[PDB]
Amino acid sequence: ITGTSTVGVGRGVLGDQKNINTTYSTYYYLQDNTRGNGIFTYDAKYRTTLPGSLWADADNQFFASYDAPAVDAHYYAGVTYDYYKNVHNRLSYDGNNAAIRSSVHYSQGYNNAFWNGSQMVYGDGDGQTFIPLSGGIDVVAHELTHAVTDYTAGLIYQNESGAINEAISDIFGTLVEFYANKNPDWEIGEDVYTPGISGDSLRSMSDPAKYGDPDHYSKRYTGTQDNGGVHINSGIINKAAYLISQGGTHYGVSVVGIGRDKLGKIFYRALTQYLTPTSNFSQLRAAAVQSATDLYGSTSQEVASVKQAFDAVGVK
Numbered sequence: 469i470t471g472t473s474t475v476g477v478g479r480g481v482l483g484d485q486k487n488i489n490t491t492y493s494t495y496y497y498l499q500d501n502t503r504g505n506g507i508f509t510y511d512a513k514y515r516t517t518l519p520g521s522l523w524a525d526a527d528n529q530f531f532a533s534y535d536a537p538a539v540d541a542h543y544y545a546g547v548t549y550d551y552y553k554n555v556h557n558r559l560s561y562d563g564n565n566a567a568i569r570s571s572v573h574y575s576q577g578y579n580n581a582f583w584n585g586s587q588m589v590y591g592d593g594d595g596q597t598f599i600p601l602s603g604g605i606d607v608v609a610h611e612l613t614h615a616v617t618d619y620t621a622g623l624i625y626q627n628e629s630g631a632i633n634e635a636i637s638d639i640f641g642t643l644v645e646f647y648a649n650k651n652p653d654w655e656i657g658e659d660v661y662t663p664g665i666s667g668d669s670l671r672s673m674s675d676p677a678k679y680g681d682p683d684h685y686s687k688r689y690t691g692t693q694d695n696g697g698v699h700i701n702s703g704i705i706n707k708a709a710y711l712i713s714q715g716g717t718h719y720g721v722s723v724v725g726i727g728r729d730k731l732g733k734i735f736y737r738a739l740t741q742y743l744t745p746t747s748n749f750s751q752l753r754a755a756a757v758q759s760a761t762d763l764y765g766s767t768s769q770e771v772a773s774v775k776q777a778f779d780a781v782g783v784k
């Protein structure tokens with residue numbers, strides 16, 4: 469909507485205070501004009517009609533329990549925008565500053581979040597498996613990254629291409645979490661998953677097997693559940709990415725770590741210049757090797773490490 473840019477204050481899902489960019493016109497709306505063509509956050513009001521209504525607030529203070537998922541969806545979308553712009557010179561998910569839209573309070577007891585082809589959508593969780601999912605910066609960045617993938621490589625959401633799609637979202641979700649630098653880790657969704665259980669997470673990139681996800685191609689799932697295991701087989705690629713960044717010896721294969729920034733550069737280039745909708749794991753390896761070659765040279769440690777990592781997870 470048309471109005472003047474304002475700065476509200478509120479509390480997120482985890483109880484932390486933050487400032488948020490709003491727009492004033494009679495009400496204060498969750499509309500951040502400071503980034504691209506705007507970040508807009510909507511109330512789905514426990515229903516499934518999308519987007520719902522642009523979030524309106526009378527006083528620009530967002531401290532009510534009902535406000536918390538909106539505060540975080542809005543704020544973490546901003547952080548994710550900043551990551552892509554500042555680190556990769558990418559303007560929003562389409563590269564042309566597309567408006568970024570999110571809806572919170574989607575459905576009832578909804579233990580998931582998704583990109584619906586046009587916007588991000590966050591459940592509140594049932595209070596047992598999840599609390600409101602926008603409370604996780606890695607989750608928000610995971611969702612926005614699906615939009616980036618859809619506008620670039622276009623990885624089909626099933627089987628190997630779908631597992632790559634998932635891993636790309638986990639990788640950049642994690643890199644955004646490190647970018648913000650608040651309790652960063654290589655786990656996925658730990659801030660909003662299972663409030664009654666400390667120390668766990670939805671997935672682990674450092675050790676996918678801790679939750680039964682494969683960490684080697686020989687352990688890949690080939691059934692039909694979960695679109696051919698897109699949230700399962702992502703572990704194989706997540707592990708490779710973790711090794712590229714952090715190093716380690718995995719099934720006897722040693723990988724020299726090159727750090728998060730170079731991991732991000734290599735995978736961003738692969739995603740935007742080499743991957744296609746039908747890319748499989750072997751083709752991702754080739755794309756990553758070529759990307760590292762472009763960036764660092766054929767004889768570089770970076771190229772050698774990419775090869776080591778894919779060797780370690782059994783992807784040739």
Ligand SMILES: CCCNC(=O)[C@H](CC(C)C)NP(=O)(O)CNC(=O)OCc1ccccc1
Binds near residue numbers: 584610
């Ligand atoms: C919890 C179940 C698995 N979900 C996830 O791993 C993450 C959320 C995590 C990061 C907390 N959600 P996601 O992967 O975006 C869910 N994906 C999903 O719903 O895709 C299916 C789909 C939805 C709309 C349009 C096309 C296709």
Ligand SMILES: [Ca+2]
Binds near residue numbers: 525526528530531
């Ligand atoms: Ca208020």
Ligand SMILES: [Ca+2]
Binds near residue numbers: 651652653659
């Ligand atoms: Ca964390």
Ligand SMILES: [Ca+2]
Binds near residue numbers: 606
């Ligand atoms: Ca995390």
Ligand SMILES: [Ca+2]
Binds near residue numbers: 658661667
């Ligand atoms: Ca937990």
Ligand SMILES: [Zn+2]
Binds near residue numbers: 610614
């Ligand atoms: Zn996903």
